[PDB]
Amino acid sequence: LGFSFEFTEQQKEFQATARKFAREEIIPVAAEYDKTGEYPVPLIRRAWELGLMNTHIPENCGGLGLGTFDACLISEELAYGCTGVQTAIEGNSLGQMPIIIAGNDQQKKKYLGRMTEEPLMCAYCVTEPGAGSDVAGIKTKAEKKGDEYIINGQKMWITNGGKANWYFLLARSDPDPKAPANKAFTGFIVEADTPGIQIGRKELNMGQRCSDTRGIVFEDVKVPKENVLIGDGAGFKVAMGAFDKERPVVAAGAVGLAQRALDEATKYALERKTFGKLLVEHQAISFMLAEMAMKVELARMSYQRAAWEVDSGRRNTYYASIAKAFAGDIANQLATDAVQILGGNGFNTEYPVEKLMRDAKIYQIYGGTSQIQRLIVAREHIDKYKN
Amino acid sequence: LGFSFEFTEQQKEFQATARKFAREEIIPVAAEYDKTGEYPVPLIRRAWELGLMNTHIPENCGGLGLGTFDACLISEELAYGCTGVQTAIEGNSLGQMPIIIAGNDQQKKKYLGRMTEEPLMCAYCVTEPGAGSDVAGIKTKAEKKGDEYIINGQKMWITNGGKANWYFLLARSDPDPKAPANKAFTGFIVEADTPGIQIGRKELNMGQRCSDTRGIVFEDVKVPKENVLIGDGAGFKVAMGAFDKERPVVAAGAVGLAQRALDEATKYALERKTFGKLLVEHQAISFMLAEMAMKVELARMSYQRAAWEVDSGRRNTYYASIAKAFAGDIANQLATDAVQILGGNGFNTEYPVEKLMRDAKIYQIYGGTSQIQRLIVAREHIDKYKN
Amino acid sequence: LGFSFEFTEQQKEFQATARKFAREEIIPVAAEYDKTGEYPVPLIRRAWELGLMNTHIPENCGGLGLGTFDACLISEELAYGCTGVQTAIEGNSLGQMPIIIAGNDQQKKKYLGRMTEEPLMCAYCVTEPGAGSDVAGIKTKAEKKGDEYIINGQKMWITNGGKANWYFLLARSDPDPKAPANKAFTGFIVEADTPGIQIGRKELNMGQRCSDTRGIVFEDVKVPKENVLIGDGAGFKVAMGAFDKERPVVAAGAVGLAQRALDEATKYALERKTFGKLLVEHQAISFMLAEMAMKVELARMSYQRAAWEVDSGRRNTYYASIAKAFAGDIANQLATDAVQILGGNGFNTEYPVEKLMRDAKIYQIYGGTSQIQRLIVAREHIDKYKN
Amino acid sequence: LGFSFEFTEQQKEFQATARKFAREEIIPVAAEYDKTGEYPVPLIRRAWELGLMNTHIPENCGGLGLGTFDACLISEELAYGCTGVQTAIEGNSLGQMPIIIAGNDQQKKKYLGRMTEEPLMCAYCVTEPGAGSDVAGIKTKAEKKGDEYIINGQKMWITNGGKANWYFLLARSDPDPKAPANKAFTGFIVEADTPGIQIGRKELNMGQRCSDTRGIVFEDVKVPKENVLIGDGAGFKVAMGAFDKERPVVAAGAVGLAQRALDEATKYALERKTFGKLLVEHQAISFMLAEMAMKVELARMSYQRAAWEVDSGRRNTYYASIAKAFAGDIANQLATDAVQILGGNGFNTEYPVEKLMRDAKIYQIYGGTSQIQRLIVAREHIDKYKN
Ligand SMILES: Cc1cc2nc3c(=O)[nH]c(=O)nc-3n(C[C@H](O)[C@H](O)[C@H](O)COP(=O)(O)OP(=O)(O)OC[C@H]3O[C@@H](n4cnc5c(N)ncnc54)[C@H](O)[C@@H]3O)c2cc1C
Ligand SMILES: Cc1cc2nc3c(=O)[nH]c(=O)nc-3n(C[C@H](O)[C@H](O)[C@H](O)COP(=O)(O)OP(=O)(O)OC[C@H]3O[C@@H](n4cnc5c(N)ncnc54)[C@H](O)[C@@H]3O)c2cc1C
Ligand SMILES: Cc1cc2nc3c(=O)[nH]c(=O)nc-3n(C[C@H](O)[C@H](O)[C@H](O)COP(=O)(O)OP(=O)(O)OC[C@H]3O[C@@H](n4cnc5c(N)ncnc54)[C@H](O)[C@@H]3O)c2cc1C
Ligand SMILES: Cc1cc2nc3c(=O)[nH]c(=O)nc-3n(C[C@H](O)[C@H](O)[C@H](O)COP(=O)(O)OP(=O)(O)OC[C@H]3O[C@@H](n4cnc5c(N)ncnc54)[C@H](O)[C@@H]3O)c2cc1C
C-alpha cells in the first residue's frame, strides 16, 4: 500500500536500546578487546540481557520471534561500536538459523530453548580448509551406522568455534562423487561436548581479533538420527537457505562499520585545520565525505530492501547479494578514506580509524566473498531474460 | 507501520500505461527522431492524452494531482524508450513547478489550467551563457516600471525554449551588487508571445538531439506585476525549491536510460557467441552484467527515497542530491559498458546503444552538475556534526 | 645501457612536422569531416608527401624505414588533431605490416613500392560479422585449386575497406573444424580489382565518422599462388605478429586524443569562472586536471615502452597489451572529464570536446578489445611463474 | 639520445645484490620483526656492509656517490622483502639529503663521514603535531644568540628518531608571521645527544611496526652557527629540495610492496583450486591479476622516469609527484587484492599478504599525502598553460 521509509515505534525502541549499548558499553572497551583479543563475555552477557541477541528464536521457545529487518536494525547499531563483538553475537543467529527454518518442534524446543534460558553460544560449521566458496566440495563425512551418523572431518574458520554449546554441521552423506549437491549433504545439530570433537586453537587474524575463530576436528563423532534437520540429503538447501536469510544482516554489520568511519572522519574534519582552513573547507575532503555519505546511505537501503524481501515471503537471493557485495565493498572504501582524512594520526593505534580498516576487510571475504556475490546476482539477473 | 517496497494498485497502473507507451510507441521512433532532431510533437500529444504528462497540476485546475513519487515512476518508463522525448516532457513539470509551489489561485487557474486544455509546452528559464551552477550569478534584470517590470537579459540552454507557450523566468530585481541571494531575485511567468522576446535557433547537441534546446533574448519585455510568483525578492527561494522537487525525477530519467542499456547488453550477451560459448558464459562479462544490475538497482532505490521524502512533507535536499549524483553517474557507466558488450556493433549507429551513450552524458550536467551535487550533500552532511 | 627518456634529433624533427600538420592543417577541418563523414582525401595526400604516412616501408622499397617508436611519436601528434584521419592513415601501416614482417622481396616492391609512388591506401581484412575477437572463429574459406586459390567469405568493419588498392586477407584453408589456429589459416594479398569482390555501403558510426569503415564480400575471388605470404597454415602467426607491431601505435593515437582532451579542458578552466573564481581555483577541478595529466603521462610511457621492445628486437606482446588496455581506457576517461569541465558547452557540437568523447570509444574495442587485452596480459604474466 | 629501458651492467649488479639480500635475509625474518616491532638492527647493519645503505654519500666522503635512479633500484628490492626494514634504511638517505644538497664540505666530511665509518643512523625532523603536509606552518623556534642558535619546539612522527646519531631539523627563525615561507625557516644539523632533546616513546602504528617512529621535544637545545645549512632563512627550499629528490625512491618502495603482493597472490592462485579449477582459470581471477600487473609495471616506469629526470640535472617535481601519487595508490590496491585472492587465509596472520595491507597504507600518507601530490601535479600542469 505504497512505499515507506518510516520505522514502527517498536523498531524505533529496539534501535535506541541497541544504540545506547553500542556507544556507552561497546565503544569504550572495543580497543581493549581488540588489543588483547579476549572473547568479550561481559558484552555478550549484556547484549543477551537487553535482548539484542537471539531475536529470531520463536516465541514458543522463549524468544522474541523477530524478523530479519529487525535483526539488521540491531546489528548495524552493534557493529558501529565494534564488528568484532557483533560477529560473536551474530554467530548465534547464523548457527541457529538452519534450525529456525527447518528443525521440527522438538529440535527447536531443545536447541533454541536453551539459548533463551542462559547466555549460551552456538556456531555454524560448513567451511573446510579445502572448500569455502565451493560448498559442494566439503568432504567431512557422515556415515549412517545404526541409529546414529558417524561424522569424520576437519572444519575451518568457524566463528564461536571453541565457545559453542552446539554446532550446525554440514557433512557429505552420499559417497558417490557423481551425486548432485542437492542430494549429497546432510545437516546435523551436534552438541559440542560429544567425544571426538577436537577444537583447535584461536586463529590470529588481521581484524575482528576478539571474535572467536577456530578450526575443529571431528574424529568419529556419533550423532543421533534425531539431530538430522529434514532428512538424509536435505543439508544443502538448509545451508543455502540460512545464507539467504543471513546476508542482509551481514550486510548490515558492514554498514555499521562504514557509518563509524564516516562519523569519525567527519568529526576530525571539523577539528583539524591546515593551510589556515578547516579540513572540511578543502573542497577535496568535502567531496570525500560527500561520496562517503552517499555510499553508507545506498548500502543501508540495500539491506533494508533485502531484509524486507525475506520478511515478506519473497525470494531475496538477488537483493541480498547486491546488499552484501555493495555494503562489504564500500565498508572497506570508507574505512581507508577515514584513516586518510586523519593523516599520520589515522595510521596510529591511539586512534579508532585504523582498527576499522582492519575489521572492514572480512566483509569482502566471509558470508560469500565479493566474487561469489557477483556470480549470484549475474545468475538471478540473466535468468530473468531467458526462458 | 514500517518499511514497504510495494507500489499501490494505482501506481502499478500508471507504470503499465507509461511502459506500454514507451515500449510500443516511443522505442520504434526514438532512433529517427534522434537522427532528424525533429521535435517529437506526435509522441508528446499521445503522452498528453494518455495522462502521462502534467501529472502535478492540481485537480482543481484539471490536473491529476499526483506527487513526485508518481512522476518519477512514470518518467523512468518514458526515459527507457527515449530520454530525448522524456526530457521534452519533463520540461513542462519543471516550468510548472514554481507555480505549483508558489503560485496563487489566480495564477494556477490561468497558467496551469490551459495545460489541461491542450498539449501546450512551457519552459524553465534561469540559465545563462555566463551562469548555470551559480544561480546567484545571473545578470538578466527586471526594472519595476509602474505596474510593469521590464526584463532585460538573455537566457541560454532553455529546454523547450522556442516551443513554450509561457515561461518561468528568474531575473535579478535588486540592483545593489552586495545584496544577498535571498532577496535579490524575482520569479516571473512570462507569456511567450510577449514582444521583446527573441528565440534563438535549435542548439545542436551530442545527446537528446530531438528535444528543443535553445537560447532566448528578452529586449524590453514588459511583465504585469500580476505575474510575479510570491513577490519582489522571493525568486531565489522559489527556484531552489523547484529543483528539490524535480531532482529525484531527473534522477529517475537517468535510471530509465540505465535500465535500457542493461536490457540491451543482456539480450545481446545471451545471443552473441565468442570462443565457442555465449558471452554470458565468460565470467568477465557476467561480472560486468552483475555490477550493472547492482548499480541501476541501488540508483532506483535512491530516487524512490528522495521522492517519498518530499511527498511526506520533508526537506529532501540531502536524498535528492545523492539520487541525482549517483543516478547521473551510473547512467553513464552502464551506457559505456552496454556498447562495450556489443563490440563493433555497439559502436555502430544501426544499434540502439551508441545513442544511449550520447544521451546519458547530460545527466551529469543539467539539473545540477555532478560536482555541485556533491557540494550540496557535503553541506547537508556537515551540519549534522556542528552544534 | 642506462635509462634514457630523450628523443634523437631526427625523431624530434618528425614530431614537429606531424605536429604542425596536425595543428595547422588538420584541426581547422576536423569538425567538417566529422559532420559530413566524407573521406579526408586532401589531408591523407598532404601527409603522404610529408613522409608521416607509410613510415614502416623499407628504404629499398622507396620507403623511409621508420621503426615502431617513430610511428608512435608521429601517430600521437596526428591523433591530437583527429583520430578519424589518423585511423585511415593508420589503416595503411596495419595493412602493410603483414607484408613487411612476412613478405618476400617480389611481394615487397610489388605492394610496398607502389605505395611509395602514389598515396594509395590499403586495408587489413581479418574480422568478420560473426567473429571479431575470436580470430580462430574466422569462416572465410580459401581453397587451393591448382596454381591458385579460390576464396569465398565476408568481412565486416574494414578500415579503408572501400578505398584500398590491395587487401590483406586472412582466411581458413584447413576445412577440418579441429585444425589448430597454427595450421588452419592462410594470409593472402588480394588486390581490390579481382572480380568477385563487392564493397558494401559505408557504415555510420558514433565516432571517427570520416574514416572509411565498410564490409567486403569475397564472392568467388581467385588469388594467384604467388600472392600467398609464408605459405599454408602460416596466416595466424603473421596476423598476431602484425598486431603485435601495431598495438603500441593504436595505444599512441589514443594518447593523442587524450592530450587534446586535457588541453581543451585546461584552457577552458583558465577562462571560465564560477562563484567568483576561475574553474581551476576549485579543488575538485584542479584535482581533476591533475589526474588527467597523470593518466596521460603514464599512458605515453606505456606505449613508448611497448614500441621500444619490438624495435629493440624483443617480443612485446606483454607491454603491448598493457599499453593498449591502459591507453584505450584513460582516453575514454579523459574525453568524458573534458566534456564535464566545459559544462553545457561541452555537450554542444560547436565545441571540440564532444567529438573526442565519440571518438575515444573505439579505442576500447578495435585492435583487441579491453577484455582480450586483459586476457593476453594475464597469460603473459602467469606464464612466468609456473614450470 | 634515444629512449632506453635497460639498466647498465653495474646497476644490474646492485639489483642482484639488493635482491638476494632481501629475499634470503629480510623475508625469512620480516614476520618476526613485524610482530615484535623490534628494530631490525642485524638487517640494517648487514645492508650497511653490503653497500646498500648510504648510497648517496659522495665518494670524497667515503661513499659510493650514487644517484637517485640507483637508489630507487635498490629500494624497490629491499621493500619487496619488507617496507618496515626498507623504511629505516631509507630514513638515513632522506635525513642526509639536505646536507648533501646544501652542506658545505666541512659539514659534509663531519656528518656524511660518520655514516661511512659505522652504522650510524640519522633522521629528518620536519613534521610536528601541528603540521605535516602544511610544512610552512611549523612552530619550532630557532633563536639567534651570537654565533649559535637556540632551538625550542616539538617534532612528531620522526623516522629513526630515538635511533639517530644526528638530526636534520627545520625550525622557524623569523617570528614575523607576515614573513614569506621562502625566508622564514632555517635548517640545522644537530648531534642527537645535545642537552634539551627529549626523545619520546616508540609509536605503535598499524604498518611498518619494526620501523622506529617517535616524537621529540627540543627544550632549549643549543645549536652552533656552523651547523646551519645555506644561511639563516634558507631552510625552506632546502627541505623542499630534499623532498623532490627523495619522493621517487618513496614511490619505488611502494612498487616493491606491490610486486610482493603480486607474486604472493599469483603463486597462491596457481595452486588453490575451487569449483574443480585453479583460481587462475576463473576468468575474473586472471582479469584481477592482469590489472594488478598493469598497475605495478606502470608505477615502476613512473618512478624510473622521475628518477632519471633528477639525475638529468632538470627539475623532476611534476614526475616525482606523478610517481608518488600513482605508486602509493596502486600499492594499496594490490595489497588489498592480494588479501582477496588468498581468501580466508589472506585475512590470517599466518600468511604474508595481511602484513602488506597494513604496511601499504602509509604510502598514501607519508612523503606527501595523495591529496597534496595532486595539488602539486595540478600546479605544475596549469602552469604550462600560464604564460
Ligand atoms: C574470520 C572468518 C570467520 C569465518 N567464520 C565462518 C563461520 O562462522 N562459519 C563458516 O562456516 N565459515 C566461516 N568462514 C569462512 C568464510 O565464509 C570463507 O572464507 C569464504 O567463504 C571464502 O572461502 P575461502 O577462504 O575458502 O575462499 P576460496 O574459495 O579459497 O577463494 C579464494 C579466492 O578465489 C575466489 N574464487 C573462488 N571461486 C571463484 C569463482 N568461481 N569465481 C571467481 N572467483 C572465485 C574467491 O572469491 C576468493 O577471492 C569465516 C572466515 C573467516 C576468515
Ligand atoms: C540539453 C540541456 C538542457 C538544459 N535545459 C535547461 C533548462 O530548461 N533550463 C535551465 O534553466 N537550464 C538548462 N540547462 C543548463 C544547465 O542547467 C547548466 O549547463 C548546468 O546546470 C551548469 O552548467 P554550466 O554550463 O553553467 O557549467 P559551469 O557552471 O560553467 O561549470 C562547468 C564545470 O565546472 C564545474 N564547477 C562549477 N562550479 C564548481 C564549483 N564551485 N566547484 C567545483 N566544480 C564546479 C561544473 O560541475 C562543471 O563540471 C540545460 C543544459 C543542457 C545542455
Ligand atoms: C570502426 C572500426 C574499424 C575496425 N577496423 C578493423 C579492420 O581494419 N580490420 C579488422 O580485422 N577489424 C577491424 N575492426 C573490428 C574490431 O577489431 C572488432 O570489433 C573487435 O576486435 C571486437 O570484435 P567484435 O566486434 O566481433 O566483438 P565480440 O568478439 O563479439 O565481443 C563482444 C564483447 O564481448 C567481449 N569478449 C569477447 N570474448 C571475451 C572473452 N573470452 N572474455 C571476456 N570478454 C570477451 C568483448 O571484449 C566485447 O566486450 C574495426 C572495428 C570498428 C568498429
Ligand atoms: C609512520 C610515519 C613516518 C613518518 N616519518 C616522517 C619523518 O621521518 N619525518 C617527518 O618530518 N615527517 C614524517 N612523518 C609525517 C608525515 O610527513 C605526515 O604524516 C604527512 O605529511 C601528513 O601530515 P599530517 O599527518 O599532519 O596530515 P594533515 O596535514 O593533518 O592532513 C590530513 C588529511 O587531510 C588532507 N589534506 C590536508 N590539507 C589538504 C589540502 N589542502 N587539500 C586536500 N587534502 C588536504 C591530507 O591530505 C590528509 O589526507 C611520518 C608519518 C608517519 C605516520
Short mmCIF file of C-alpha atoms in Angstrom, two decimals, chain D residues 112-267:
data_model
loop_
_atom_site.label_atom_id
_atom_site.label_comp_id
_atom_site.label_asym_id
_atom_site.label_seq_id
_atom_site.Cartn_x
_atom_site.Cartn_y
_atom_site.Cartn_z
CA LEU D 112 78.23 12.22 5.90
CA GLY D 113 81.61 10.86 7.02
CA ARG D 114 80.38 9.10 10.17
CA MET D 115 77.93 7.07 8.10
CA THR D 116 80.81 5.76 6.00
CA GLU D 117 82.73 4.61 9.13
CA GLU D 118 79.94 2.92 11.34
CA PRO D 119 76.05 2.09 11.03
CA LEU D 120 75.04 5.20 12.22
CA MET D 121 71.52 6.26 11.58
CA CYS D 122 70.03 9.74 11.15
CA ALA D 123 66.60 11.39 10.98
CA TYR D 124 64.65 14.06 9.13
CA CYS D 125 62.89 16.29 11.67
CA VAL D 126 60.29 18.49 9.99
CA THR D 127 56.80 17.28 10.88
CA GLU D 128 55.29 18.19 14.23
CA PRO D 129 51.97 17.56 15.98
CA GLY D 130 50.65 20.79 14.47
CA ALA D 131 51.66 20.31 10.84
CA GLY D 132 52.93 17.69 8.44
CA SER D 133 51.53 18.50 5.00
CA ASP D 134 51.31 22.23 5.64
CA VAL D 135 55.10 22.41 6.01
CA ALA D 136 55.27 26.20 6.26
CA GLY D 137 53.15 26.01 9.43
CA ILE D 138 55.81 24.70 11.80
CA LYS D 139 56.19 26.32 15.22
CA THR D 140 59.64 25.19 16.43
CA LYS D 141 61.63 28.39 17.08
CA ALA D 142 65.30 28.97 16.35
CA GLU D 143 66.67 31.92 18.29
CA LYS D 144 70.00 33.56 17.42
CA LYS D 145 72.35 34.15 20.37
CA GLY D 146 75.53 35.34 18.74
CA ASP D 147 77.38 32.55 16.94
CA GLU D 148 74.78 29.95 17.84
CA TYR D 149 71.06 29.36 17.68
CA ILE D 150 68.87 28.07 20.50
CA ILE D 151 66.07 25.78 19.32
CA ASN D 152 62.74 25.28 21.10
CA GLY D 153 59.90 23.15 19.78
CA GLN D 154 58.47 19.70 19.29
CA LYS D 155 58.55 17.31 16.34
CA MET D 156 56.38 14.26 15.72
CA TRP D 157 56.32 11.08 13.63
CA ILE D 158 60.07 11.20 13.08
CA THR D 159 61.54 8.03 11.38
CA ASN D 160 64.64 6.83 13.21
CA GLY D 161 64.12 9.44 15.87
CA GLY D 162 65.29 7.66 19.07
CA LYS D 163 67.89 5.79 17.00
CA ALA D 164 69.50 8.66 15.07
CA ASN D 165 73.06 9.92 15.60
CA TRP D 166 72.18 13.34 14.26
CA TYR D 167 69.06 15.13 13.08
CA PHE D 168 68.33 17.46 10.19
CA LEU D 169 65.97 19.93 11.88
CA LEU D 170 63.81 22.56 10.18
CA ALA D 171 62.75 25.35 12.54
CA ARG D 172 61.24 28.82 12.16
CA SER D 173 63.71 31.63 12.81
CA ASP D 174 61.83 34.73 11.66
CA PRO D 175 58.97 35.39 14.15
CA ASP D 176 57.29 37.89 11.84
CA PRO D 177 54.37 35.70 10.63
CA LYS D 178 53.95 38.18 7.77
CA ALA D 179 57.34 36.86 6.52
CA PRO D 180 57.35 34.60 3.41
CA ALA D 181 57.94 30.85 3.55
CA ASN D 182 60.94 31.38 1.26
CA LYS D 183 62.65 33.36 4.03
CA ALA D 184 61.10 32.24 7.32
CA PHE D 185 62.83 28.95 8.14
CA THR D 186 66.37 27.79 8.88
CA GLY D 187 67.69 24.23 8.55
CA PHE D 188 70.10 22.79 11.11
CA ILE D 189 72.07 19.62 11.79
CA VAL D 190 72.16 18.61 15.45
CA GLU D 191 74.08 15.97 17.41
CA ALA D 192 71.44 13.60 18.79
CA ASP D 193 72.96 13.85 22.26
CA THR D 194 72.58 17.61 22.74
CA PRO D 195 71.05 18.56 26.09
CA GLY D 196 67.41 19.55 25.72
CA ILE D 197 66.46 16.75 23.32
CA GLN D 198 63.73 14.53 24.81
CA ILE D 199 63.05 11.52 22.62
CA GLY D 200 59.55 10.14 23.01
CA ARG D 201 58.24 6.59 23.29
CA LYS D 202 58.12 4.47 20.14
CA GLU D 203 54.75 4.86 18.41
CA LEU D 204 52.62 1.79 17.71
CA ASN D 205 51.28 2.16 14.19
CA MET D 206 49.34 -0.28 12.03
CA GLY D 207 52.09 -0.54 9.42
CA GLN D 208 55.92 -0.88 9.35
CA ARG D 209 55.77 -1.75 13.01
CA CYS D 210 59.56 -2.65 13.26
CA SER D 211 60.38 0.74 11.75
CA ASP D 212 61.16 3.18 14.53
CA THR D 213 58.77 6.18 14.73
CA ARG D 214 58.97 8.73 17.56
CA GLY D 215 58.26 12.28 18.67
CA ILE D 216 60.95 14.60 20.08
CA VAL D 217 60.95 17.65 22.35
CA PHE D 218 63.69 20.30 21.89
CA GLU D 219 63.86 22.08 25.27
CA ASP D 220 66.48 24.92 24.82
CA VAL D 221 68.69 22.81 22.60
CA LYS D 222 71.87 24.68 21.66
CA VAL D 223 72.96 24.56 18.02
CA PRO D 224 76.29 26.05 16.81
CA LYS D 225 76.33 28.51 13.91
CA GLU D 226 78.30 26.27 11.52
CA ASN D 227 75.57 23.66 11.94
CA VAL D 228 73.09 25.98 9.89
CA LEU D 229 72.51 24.83 6.30
CA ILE D 230 72.70 27.58 3.50
CA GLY D 231 72.27 30.63 5.59
CA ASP D 232 69.90 31.62 8.05
CA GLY D 233 66.46 31.61 6.46
CA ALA D 234 67.22 29.27 3.55
CA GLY D 235 65.84 26.19 5.30
CA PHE D 236 62.51 26.13 3.47
CA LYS D 237 63.80 25.48 -0.02
CA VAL D 238 66.39 23.04 1.42
CA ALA D 239 63.65 20.83 2.89
CA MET D 240 61.64 21.18 -0.31
CA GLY D 241 64.69 20.19 -2.38
CA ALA D 242 65.36 17.00 -0.42
CA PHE D 243 61.69 16.14 -0.83
CA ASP D 244 61.81 16.45 -4.62
CA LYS D 245 64.95 14.29 -4.61
CA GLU D 246 63.56 11.53 -2.36
CA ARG D 247 59.93 11.24 -3.49
CA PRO D 248 60.70 8.86 -6.37
CA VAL D 249 62.52 6.48 -4.02
CA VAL D 250 59.43 6.50 -1.77
CA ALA D 251 57.41 5.53 -4.88
CA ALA D 252 59.91 2.73 -5.58
CA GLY D 253 59.23 1.41 -2.10
CA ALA D 254 55.51 1.21 -2.77
CA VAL D 255 56.22 -0.58 -6.07
CA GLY D 256 58.39 -3.05 -4.19
CA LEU D 257 55.46 -3.84 -1.88
CA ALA D 258 53.15 -4.19 -4.90
CA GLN D 259 55.45 -6.74 -6.57
CA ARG D 260 55.47 -8.76 -3.37
CA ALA D 261 51.67 -8.65 -3.18
CA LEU D 262 51.52 -9.56 -6.88
CA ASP D 263 53.86 -12.59 -6.72
CA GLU D 264 52.46 -13.76 -3.41
CA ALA D 265 48.93 -13.79 -4.89
CA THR D 266 49.84 -15.27 -8.30
CA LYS D 267 51.63 -18.19 -6.65
#
